[PDB]
Design a protein around this ligand. Sequence first.
Ligand SMILES: COCC(CCO[C@H]1CC[C@@]2(C)C(=CC[C@H]3[C@@H]4C[C@@H]5O[C@]6(CC[C@@H](C)CO6)[C@@H](C)[C@@H]5[C@@]4(C)CC[C@@H]32)C1)COC
Length: 1199
Amino acid sequence: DPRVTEILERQIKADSYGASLVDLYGMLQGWEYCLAVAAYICSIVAGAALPLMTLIFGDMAQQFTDYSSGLHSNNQFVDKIDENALYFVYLGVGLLVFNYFATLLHIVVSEIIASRVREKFIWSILHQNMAYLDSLGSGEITSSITSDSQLIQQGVSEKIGLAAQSIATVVSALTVAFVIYWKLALVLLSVMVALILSSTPTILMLMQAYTDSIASYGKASSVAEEAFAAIKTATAFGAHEFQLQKYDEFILESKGYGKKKAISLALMMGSIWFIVFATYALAFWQGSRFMVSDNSGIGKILTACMAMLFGSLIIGNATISLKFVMVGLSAASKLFAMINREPYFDSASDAGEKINEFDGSISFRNVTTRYPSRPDITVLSDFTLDIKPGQTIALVGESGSGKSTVIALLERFYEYLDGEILLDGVDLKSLNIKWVRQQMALVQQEPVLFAASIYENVCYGLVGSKYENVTEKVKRELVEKACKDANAWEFISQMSNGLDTEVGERGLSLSGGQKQRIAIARAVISEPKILLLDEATSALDTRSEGIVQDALNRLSETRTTIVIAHRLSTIQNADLIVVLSKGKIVETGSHKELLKKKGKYHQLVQIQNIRTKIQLFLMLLQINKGDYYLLIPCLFLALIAGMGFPSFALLAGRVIEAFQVTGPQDFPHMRSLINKYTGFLFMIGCVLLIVYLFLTSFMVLSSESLVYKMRYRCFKQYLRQDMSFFDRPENKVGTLVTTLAKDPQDIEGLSGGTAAQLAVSVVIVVAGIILAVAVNWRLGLVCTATVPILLGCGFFSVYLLMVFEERILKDYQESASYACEQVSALKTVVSLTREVGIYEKYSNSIKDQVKRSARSVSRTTLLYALIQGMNPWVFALGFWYGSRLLLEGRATNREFFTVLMAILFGCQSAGEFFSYAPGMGKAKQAAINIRQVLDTRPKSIDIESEDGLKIDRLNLKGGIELRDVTFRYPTRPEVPVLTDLNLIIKPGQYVGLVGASGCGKSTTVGLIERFYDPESGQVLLDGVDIRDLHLRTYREVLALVQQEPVLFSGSIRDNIMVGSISEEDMIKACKDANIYDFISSLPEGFDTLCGNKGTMLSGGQKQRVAIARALIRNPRVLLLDEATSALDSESEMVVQDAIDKASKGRTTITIAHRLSTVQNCDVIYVFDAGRIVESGKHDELLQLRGKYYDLVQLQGLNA
Ligand SMILES: COCC(CCO[C@H]1CC[C@@]2(C)C(=CC[C@H]3[C@@H]4C[C@@H]5O[C@]6(CC[C@@H](C)CO6)[C@@H](C)[C@@H]5[C@@]4(C)CC[C@@H]32)C1)COC
């Protein structure tokens, strides 16, 4: 026991891992560490060289101020301005070169690292034991292959380079500010740190508001999950407003937290735009104060102030880059946990023996095993079977007996705790696992063909064989012989291309028989010694089964086969038959020897014989008409927030003019002017604080209101669709839930802080351009020509970063699809021992992809680096032209610096809107999606249409008539379910419908509830076609009890009152359903929460609750769609008692699986091929000795 539990856990145990940047960068080998080192050096250099514009700008400001005061001649002014302009040009060239190299090398390093990670992950997954792989499923592996490697790239991509660059920019800016002027640098740093630590509660408030909103929608998404999954019940009982209200009570909490988010974001914006203005004001004021004792200068004051603001305002890009780094370190932890986990079986290694001249004899001895998923159920107990070369065993039994476990043990998919399996006398636990899998040939129930030619598909079976490395000409002969031995040449030679025809997602689309015949050829081409047929023909049809069975019989006549069959008629010629029940060999023997024994095999063959006998702005603007009271003041607020910066420009120009001292004699006047202008600078820096607070608050409130409206209307629109909408493949529950989660949240990109920043940006740019033209027309025209350049650079930087982000996922699609295809089926790949070939092909593919992507990245990085280097060139040109104008007398120091601050610096602040450009693509795709969703309507079955006759309850009888009803499910329209059905149910009749699987009796409920409309026919209620009746009232007439009871989350009172057409009736119906006593037994009364398995009541109790729910409305037509199919025999008694009690006094249509429920029905209708075959009472159908007799005999035999 301590050993078997250890084995069953070590089979499935999954260790936890913590990945750091060391693990990611350890995939670089040899000369690829120089690439990473050079990338980081270039990033650091290009980040540290950026705050030198502050040095050159301060020097140029000092030169302009000194010349305007007449401290040097024209020639010296020209010389110094030219030299400083060249310094700008050199800085721009250096920024270009280093940005290019840093970005290119970072991207290349990320490509290399992720290629190594992908190779390692695929090599691990392909060699894990099948117990662990079945634990994860395919979804966990396919997701890890496609969207968890992209995150690992982004972690080590140019994002980490930008994070390092930004940290270097902060360090270099602080270093510049301290060296040039530590007195003012220290003062500014202290004040800014005090104003940043003070705004710490606001950041906590924002993060709490985001967490609360995410949690509240998480709860709301759960209500949507149940509503779409349980959509048949909701439509049948009209619980559309109930589920919509449940959703609304949770998407209103998100709006309340969005309010707090609005205040917090407004506070953060106001604090930032107050810190900047207070830093300018304090820098100028305290630099004028210090200057009367240091003679430092406006140049040094500007250098210090600009350096401090530079480093502080570069922090925001660093945070998103570090978020990107940390997101890719969480995925790295998962992938490295899945890589470093060592498998239970060492199938990768070459250890183990290899039997020479393997005859094929197998000898099981006392074999006992458990699956790791369920360590209490024993799926095989004391299995003993000695198989000789050439024999044909045939394991049979009921489902769950454990016949299929033998094949899993022989292929080393799972581990047998106790026993012994000997291949020609050699233990199975001491053999090379891949060799053992090569000696066998697993023909599975579902054939899996890979997207390749038929020749390649059949050649996949040659792995490890002696024919693996031979001439291609010989291989084609072998494939032809194998396809002829498998009865596959008849449809391959008839093909267009023949053996080279593509299959799978390309080329031709085969049938089940043809795919199974190609799988048989693939299995037989290797000349296996053991054949493992695992219900090969269980998934085929009557016509196609013959050819595949002939092929299998031809194959099994020589090899040591182990056939697992569900059609017992195909194994009559087996050399031995083993009957398994609950994991034990109940009896064994030949076909004749077992029939005479009157045993389990006889019952199985009897059952088999009996069965054989049988522009989008205006859209959202119109939707959010109610929020205008918030967006009308926002225009005025944005206009004021826009006048702000072009008045800081005027005051800054006047301050720079006031710093035109010629000696300590002019210091009192300079101090007076600096105080007078710094007062106004601080007053303006406080007005914009309030303006930004109000504007951002109002805009974020509007955005949250729009998101709430989108969610509410989208959920309301999903509930209006007919049942033909929800059974489409693209309207899955998990897809609709995801769409609700994403699109009403992505549409927020066209409102809120983004729209506020858009308005503020355009106003700021327009006001700055107008100010530059008005102050000096000769200087406001040239500097206007640079506004397109600066704005284009600011936009295209973000655009190219988006391009870099998207290339990561766009490039690795072919190889990811190939890997996901070969990982969708691990059992077939592992059976063929195709790990090595798949890994080689995948490794070659991604190695080629690295080189293919490096070139395109090198092409784009040139434009990115040029855009990065443009800015110092614009500065140089502007300063040179300004100096020339100021020499000619056509400009002034005040006018030049006012124009410069406004134009250049205003375009810098308004480029923050371009950081919201990535959202505007999502916010347009989501707008298109929401427009499509909000406009879709059901063709005829509209629950929210008020047209149609109303059913008068006084004259209602309850007569249902299906007149010549023909119906096909629109998802599968080639398979008719009901054909020319004629069925009349008299009022008060307890009609029961019975039949075999696929007869289509359950479609009667769908037609009566009007889930679907019949293609040709007429369903009538009291002589009125239900297509001409009011849908809500009509469905209020009917009631429905389903096979699997569904109870919505909430109290028992809420669930049972879902089917309330209009407190006494509730108690009366709860007593009539034999559930009132159980409810009274509960600690609370009808307030017990049975949601998400809150109390997990018994199936009988949940069915009785559903019966009471259907019974409150007092229906005229009670539909019981196999109510007692999933109930225990003890609870079935009370449930059937409740059903019989409820069936009195109303029309009752009872679809039945167990024929005992329909025993006392007034009329019984037998279904076959969608048409009524027999009809009448129980005794008459028994006397007719027809299909009903066969069904009751089958029920008796099944027991
Ligand atoms: C945007 O919303 C994203 C959302 C929720 C994230 O919550 C917040 C977590 C803190 C974070 C990263 C956020 C916004 C601005 C960020 C701040 C800007 C400020 O700038 C500085 C420097 C410059 C100074 C002038 C002001 O203060 C920093 C100290 C401040 C800052 C870097 C501190 C961290 C802030 C988002 C998650 O979405 C998946």
